Design a protein around this nucleic acid. Structure first.
Lengths: 493, 260, 241
DNA sequence: CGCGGACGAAGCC
DNA sequence: TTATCACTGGCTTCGTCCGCG
């Protein structure tokens, strides 16, 4: 019979902090056990990883450190585990000992992260090409990402199938898909992924161990909860997705909006067909903000995670990752709990370094770009001053930058009574990141004064240099020169 | 054996291809922005003349039919470089207004005010074709003859169709240089990495500049490359480019003959 | 063994991590790209073991960083529905929706000098001199500068990029020296990116991560060339000797 | 009467 | 001095309706 154990069968790429040669593929158990020896384990799809780090954080929280002066007891228990440096393998095999038969992805009953009843009531298989990302599904245009005619498709290996699976449970097309009659009701319509189009932020250490431990969000006191893959019950598609105060409900793993089924190859080496289909009809609000994402409120008062953006340079978001101030956005709770000195770790904070997964795509089923971003290491009153410099910097920076946008745009119009904005921003941000990074490290940057609280209008000189680099050849005819300079004067501040 | 062609085709005030906005595509090169016509656009035009004139050498010479499913040969052994202007070019805005024919008891409140961008210049075009893969894939050497000869003349004659009804950009290349090279393909693009200065025209000056670059590269690498070039001017000699030919089809004939 | 490559030309684009309509290039050459170009020069069919190319080293000096531009790039627009790009289902979509709109990015006016150092790099140079398929910088449409290989054979090429290879014109203050140039080392800011190509098979191209270290280095100001047309002369002078 | 082609149903404010 | 300032599209599966043969 086809079987594929996630704990045993290798699928997580792993490079240790040692040797730094030949990264080896490991299963989930072997990875989770040798965490202290390996530096990191990765998968090529940032969405897949964006949910992966959630799965590992939840699992290691359920093994150690759940439910629970609750705050001081959590930070104390937290301090012991961070100081000890190694989880005992017997508690991992004891945590898996409760769900030993449940981690098969092709299990006859209760398949991993799947719905077994979906195989019936679904006359047409979606196909591997409809599940995996970057693979042209049935009606898509075939042009890019390898041509796949949806006729005799080469079956994915199971590991990559797990990656694309995790992606679909996270980000998933909100469009209508294959229909499933459930007790007479067939609405082939499918909802959107729970965190579709946001960049997840997981902090890192020197190995996966302490990183995964800092990944654990603080569970507020409430009802004990359990994940979708930890549910003894098989979900009923109709009804309300009941709320969940437990950490498995705020780690977005209590139930996923989509539902995938993978048809196994006789050996279990490949996936041959797939079914992606709706699991719930009426959408309900999930309690509490996702600790990983940066939230932000725009007029109308809507609290929403800032949608990723391929165009934006990442560094500005990193500034938001800091607070005790509020710059118009709510922000991320895990970062707030995890990194300030009120917490408890002594030194790991000095060497921790933040990582970002951002899959920016349509509000529908269209997709444009994903990206990872292992940004350096960043961390009271003295610290408050360093953050204050960072804010007053990112502020002056984008503010004058967009003012240069309006400038360029308007300029070209009033001239002609625009091609300048695109190239303007390209050189601008490309030239602007290193100047910012010099400001944060308090290094000397021309037009900027080291160790002065004020911004120093350095970005004025950068934007002016970029502006002249773009508009140079068109300040030629006297009229256009008049408009272009009279709008360049505004960047002088 | 690679046969590559360099041309210095000029285009009057035109907007053959354009961005998502109205402005033409531009490559900032040598510190000076310079208009370009992307490679795929000109290549698609070439594909239509070659296939029209031929009445599967098109899936061989060019990579793969756009409307056909991949037939295990997606590559083509033809490499079109993006044409770019020899000199720096400011995008020249053309303000235009659509006229309303029926007139009310008011005057001239025209139908549509707008401004569209256009540009003109002497594009340095370039392409190479890998004969060896073409022979190995097509089989018959004569099919290779018609494919390369007919492809070459097509390379010269065609011009993309974009905003052409408003601007008649039809033209013939001023300089063509086909160099049958056995070592490796070489583009003379860096000859124009320093945009030429203006006010007197560029055809002659660009010709002689390309001559200097050909002289020097041939100096660094003396080779058995069979060369030849044809121009619409008889006033200036370009010894580095090979023997002169009276006309373009004569040249193409001599070089296809030279390949076999 | 080892030799100096110069990745130059009007436009280049060493993209990665983009698998949809928008393509994007890294501001730095990637290892996958250069390995694939050498593989094209040697006739490595798509899917053949590329392990031979493993064990190579790529120190890359950025002369001019260049300005990256967004090339708008539609495919199939303006053609009758009957001849448009096929569907996976097989039915051409309606002509009002049949045009694909890719927005491919590319680096323009950027020049890097990668110093490939390895065990057999001399044979790959022997292949660049007479390539099996045309080498290109990222997208095949981009055509390499004729000076693709500055020196066929060099003992310790990184030392020769650190000095004695000209660089493009930049501000040289009076009585100044030691102009800053960013070298990119593989081992010893920094970024993590998916480059090292495990396989080039068109059916399932897969990669693994390679750490890239960005080292601001100090090179003699004498290398910087004069403002106009001297740079080509200096490069050629270097190439012959 | 059969077949082919085209538009709509959301998800979304 | 006054009037004028375009559209269209590059999402998802399938079903139904309509035009055709």
């Amino acid at each position: 019979p086809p079987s594929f154990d996630v704990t045993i069968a290798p699928w997580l790429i792993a490079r240790s902090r040692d040797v730094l040669a030949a990264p080896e593929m490991l299963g989930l158990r072997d990875v989770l056990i040798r965490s202290h020896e390996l530096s990191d384990v990765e998968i090529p799809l940032p969405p897949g990883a964006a949910v992966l780090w959630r799965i590992l954080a939840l699992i290691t929280a359920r093994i150690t450190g759940l439910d629970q002066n609750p705050k001081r007891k959590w930070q104390a228990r937290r301090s012991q585990i961070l100081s000890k440096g190694r989880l005992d393998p017997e508690a991992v095999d004891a945590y898996f000992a409760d769900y030993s038969e449940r981690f098969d992805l092709f299990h006859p009953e209760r398949p991993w992260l799947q719905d077994p009843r979906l195989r019936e009531e679904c006359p047409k298989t979606s196909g591997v090409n409809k599940l995996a990302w970057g693979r042209t599904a049935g009606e898509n245009q075939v042009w890019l990402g390898g041509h796949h005619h949806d006729l005799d498709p080469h079956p994915l290996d199971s590991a990559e199938a797990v990656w694309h699976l995790l992606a679909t449970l996270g980000y998933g097309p909100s469009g209508m898909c294959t229909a499933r009659v459930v007790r007479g009701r067939s609405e082939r319509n499918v909802t959107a992924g729970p965190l579709r189009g946001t960049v997840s932020y997981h902090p890192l250490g020197r190995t996966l161990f302490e990183s995964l431990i800092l990944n654990i969000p603080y569970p507020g006191t409430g009802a004990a909860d359990l994940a979708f893959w930890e549910q003894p019950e098989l979900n009923d598609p109709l009804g309300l997705p009941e709320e969940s105060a437990g950490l498995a409900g705020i780690l977005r793993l209590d139930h996923f909006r989509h539902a995938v089924l993978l048809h196994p190859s006789p050996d279990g080496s490949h996936v041959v067909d797939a079914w992606v289909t709706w699991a719930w009809r009426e959408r309900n609000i999930s309690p509490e903000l996702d600790p990983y994402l940066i939230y932000q409120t725009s007029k109308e008062g809507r609290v929403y995670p800032r949608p990723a953006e391929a165009e934006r340079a990442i560094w500005r978001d990193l500034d938001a990752l800091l607070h005790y101030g509020e710059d118009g956005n709510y922000r991320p709770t895990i970062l707030d709990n995890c990194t300030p000195l009120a917490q408890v770790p002594q030194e790991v904070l000095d060497s921790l370094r933040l990582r970002a997964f951002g899959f920016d795509q349509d509000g529908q089923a269209r997709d444009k770009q994903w990206f990872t971003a292992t940004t350096p290491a960043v961390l009271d009153n003295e610290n408050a001053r360093i953050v204050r410099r960072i804010t007053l910097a990112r502020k002056a920076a984008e503010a004058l930058g967009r003012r240069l946008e309006k400038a360029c745009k308007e300029a070209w119009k009033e001239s002609n009574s625009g091609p300048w904005v695109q190239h303007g921003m390209s050189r601008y941000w490309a030239k602007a990141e290193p100047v910012f990074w010099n400001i944060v490290y308090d290094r000397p940057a021309q037009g900027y004064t080291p160790g002065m609280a004020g911004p120093g209008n350095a970005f004025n000189l950068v934007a002016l240099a970029a502006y002249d680099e773009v508009t140079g050849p068109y300040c030629e005819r006297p009229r256009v020169a008049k408009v272009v300079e009279r709008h360049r004067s505004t960047l002088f501040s | 054996t690679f046969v590559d062609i360099h041309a210095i085709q000029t285009l009057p005030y035109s907007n053959i291809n354009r961005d998502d906005l109205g402005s033409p595509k531009t490559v900032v090169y040598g510190g000076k922005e310079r208009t370009r016509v992307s490679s795929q656009s000109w290549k698609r035009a070439v594909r239509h003349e070659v296939e029209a004139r031929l009445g599967n050498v098109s899936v061989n010479l060019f990579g793969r039919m756009l409307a056909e499913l991949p037939s295990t040969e997606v590559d083509g052994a033809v490499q079109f470089a993006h044409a770019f202007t020899v000199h720096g070019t400011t995008v020249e805005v053309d303000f235009f207004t659509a006229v309303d024919d029926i007139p009310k008891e008011n005057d001239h409140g025209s139908g549509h005010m707008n401004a569209g961008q256009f540009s003109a210049g002497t594009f340095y075009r370039y392409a190479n074709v890998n004969l060896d893969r073409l022979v190995e894939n097509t089989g018959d050497a004569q099919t290779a003859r018609t494919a390369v000869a007919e492809f070459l003349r097509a390379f010269l004659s065609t011009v993309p169709s974009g905003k052409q009804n408003a601007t008649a950009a039809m033209t013939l290349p001023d300089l063509v240089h086909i160099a049958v090279r056995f070592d490796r393909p070489i583009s003379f693009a860096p000859a124009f990495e320093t945009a030429l200065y203006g006010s007197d025209g560029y055809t002659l000056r660009a010709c002689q500049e390309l001559n200097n670059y050909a002289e020097r590269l041939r100096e660094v690498w003396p080779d058995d490359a069979i060369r030849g070039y044809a121009t619409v001017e008889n006033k200036t000699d370009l010894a580095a480019l090979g023997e002169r030919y009276d006309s373009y089809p004569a040249l193409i004939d001599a070089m296809v003959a030279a390949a076999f | 063994s080892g030799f100096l490559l110069r990745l130059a030309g009007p436009m280049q684009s060493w993209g990665e991590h983009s698998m949809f309509g928008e393509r994007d290039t890294l501001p730095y050459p990637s290892r996958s790209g250069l390995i694939g170009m050498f593989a094209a020069a040697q006739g490595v069919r798509r899917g053949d073991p590329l392990d031979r190319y493993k064990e190579l080293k790529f120190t890359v000096r950025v002369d001019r960083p260049g300005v990256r531009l967004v090339d708008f790039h539609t495919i199939g627009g303006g053609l009758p529905k009957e001849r448009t790009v096929p569907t996976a289902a097989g039915e051409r979509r309606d002509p009002k929706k049949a045009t694909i709109v890719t927005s491919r990015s590319y680096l323009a006016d950027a020049v890097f000098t990668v110093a490939v150092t390895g065990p057999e790099a001399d044979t790959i140079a022997d292949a660049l001199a007479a390539p099996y398929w045309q080498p290109y910088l990222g997208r095949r449409a981009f055509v390499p500068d004729p000076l693709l290989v500055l020196r066929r054979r060099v003992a310790d090429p990184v030392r020769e990029l650190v000095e004695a290879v000209p660089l493009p014109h930049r501000r040289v203050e009076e009585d100044a020296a030691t102009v800053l140039v960013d070298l990119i080392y593989e081992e010893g800011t920094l970024t993590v990116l998916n480059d090292v190509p495990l396989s080039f098979d068109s059916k399932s191209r897969r990669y693994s991560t390679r750490q890239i270290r960005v080292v601001p280095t100090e090179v003699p100001a004498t290398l910087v060339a004069g403002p106009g047309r001297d740079y080509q002369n200096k490069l050629f002078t270097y190439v012959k000797q």
